[PDB]
Design a protein around this ligand. Structure first.
Ligand code: NAP
Ligand code: NAP
Ligand code: P7Q
Ligand code: P7Q
Lengths: 252, 254
């Protein structure tokens, strides 16, 4: 019950690492806004799991990286917080949603560079900007990056550019928000099982597994357990940091 | 009670961050070996705090940085674990102890013998402690090296000390890879300026200058660092290895 009476928004928590994160924040007593783009069935399943486990959650639909995205998300978020608490306080923001076998550098288009940046860097910035209006002293901003910002993979150049921009939001906003006691940190996963069809193919899972020093792919919960710790009071002396949650991928 | 049934060694836990760390590991249920070099009263005060908070601990005396240091520490550690548990299993090693001089030493004044003493205690001893500790450590164990933000922040009067924390961080990198097949994680936690109870922290003028290094404009409390070390010692940190964990209160924002 480390997060009793707190309110959290996990972007992209219908599926994958965001679902695992929403589930773990709710187990600690947070009221969780489960945000999704279009998969309402998956959002409703995250909420149902949280409720079955004795916590509280509600879904929020908003496609990010289009005109009106932040306003749409905050309309749903504040309505659901106000109905359940009488307040619109936001304690915890997890910028988890993203666009993700990559694109060879020669094949990347301007349209692809714009979509990746819209969703993966621009929307996170604008969500931080809006979220702090509601955020009390002692709040938490957690940006989900990627170990690819430290590990060269040409076919992930477009994606990795956006995660490099995301990490700058961590650096510069940690300094900006320090006076308010709001921390801002990056958590960087390695290859992580998000329930994608590729994780049902043992051959490919075994090749992907070799990337980790533990010679297994990450589970969504392995990353979500680290996010959950950063969301708690005991992380208060960590800000502006790169938190490696990759199972030793950057060791080689 | 995340560490029920676990045994931990915190080097240099008579005082400062190591005291705070031993106290927090014991509150999670670990049996804690409270290691010190010379200040037996301070070690006994760490133990007494753990015992009154309902935990279990015992002191282990061993000067590090001298012949026989690892042997001496492991004789005391194994005797105390065996008496209390019937086993010598070491789940958690925190390499916290260090030669750590508030005064510092400007480069012109550093001696060959100061370079030796800092390296012996701060880099050599941690290396040899890891080598010995893993014999006793199960799959799922934890090695936590206490570094310093000075590996990323230039401070000429701490050059000799910072050399040794650069060497300590290499223990983290290379040993994380070596030990991953056994499921043992190895991580650096880097404090910034942290109140360790030393006389400098009783001088508000100086505390106010020191405070400016943190983005939060306060010095760290020993518990602010200890809370992070305690998390790394738990099961929920399993997917973190080989890492530099910044526990500096935003000192490294450049
Ligand atoms: N190996 C990995 O899985 C891996 C590795 C490194 C980093 N990461 C990072 O970890 C985070 C989670 O990854 P994941 O693998 O769990 O993702 P995922 O399984 O692809 O799930 C993506 C989530 O984000 C939402 N989302 C996607 N695009 C959106 C948009 N334009 N607007 C709004 N919401 C949108 C999805 O909503 P719908 O359900 O409605 O589609 C879903 O909830 C991302 O930041 C990713 O870059 C993942
Ligand atoms: N600002 C800070 O406080 C700060 C900043 C960055 C990093 N650190 C790091 O955090 C750790 C703890 O620092 P602290 O400030 O809490 O230290 P401290 O208050 O100076 O306490 C040092 C501890 O190490 C033990 N120790 C010293 N020399 C030893 C030796 N040769 N053999 C064995 N034990 C020895 C001491 O034992 P006795 O009590 O017996 O003397 C004591 O328990 C160190 O690794 C330090 O480098 C501290
Ligand atoms: C350290 O992080 C990695 C190391 C080796 C390979 C990969 C990664 C990734 O972090 C990573 C990622 O963040 C996201 C994706 C990948 C990787 C990755 O290889 C992909 O393959 C394609 C996917 C699943 O569509 C998106
Ligand atoms: C980020 O780490 C710092 C940033 C600014 C100033 C200091 C530090 C330290 O980490 C640090 C340290 O590791 C150890 C000491 C110092 C510092 C430090 O400034 C000292 O001043 C003297 C002391 C407390 O005996 C040894």
């Amino acid at each position: 019950s480390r997060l009793t009476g707190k309110n959290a928004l996990v972007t992209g928590s219908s599926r994958g690492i965001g679902r695992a994160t929403a589930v773990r924040l709710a187990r600690e007593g947070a009221l969780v806004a489960v945000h999704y783009a279009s998969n309402e069935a998956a959002a409703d399943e995250t909420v149902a799991q949280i409720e079955r486990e004795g916590g509280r959650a509600f879904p929020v639909r908003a496609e990010l990286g289009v005109a009106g995205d932040v306003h749409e998300l905050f309309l749903g978020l504040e309505q659901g917080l106000k109905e359940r608490t009488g307040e619109t306080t936001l304690d915890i923001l997890v910028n988890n949603a993203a666009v993700t076998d990559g694109i060879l550098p020669e094949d990347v288009t301007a349209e692809q560079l714009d979509r990746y940046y819209a969703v993966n860097a621009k929307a996170p910035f604008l969500l931080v900007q809006r979220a702090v209006r509601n955020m009390p002293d002692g709040g938490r901003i957690i940006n989900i990056s990627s170990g690819l910002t430290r590990c060269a993979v040409p076919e992930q150049v477009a994606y990795s550019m956006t995660k490099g921009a995301l990490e700058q939001i961590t650096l510069h906003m940690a300094k900006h928000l320090a006076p308010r006691g709001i921390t801002v940190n990056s958590v960087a996963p390695g290859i992580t099982d998000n329930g994608g069809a590729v994780f049902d193919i043992p051959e490919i899972v075994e090749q992907m597994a070799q990337s980790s020093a533990f010679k297994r792919v990450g589970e969504a919960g392995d990353v979500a357990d680290v996010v959950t710790f950063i969301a708690t009071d005991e992380s208060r002396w960590i800000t502006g940091a790169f938190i490696d949650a990759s199972g030793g991928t950057l060791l080689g």
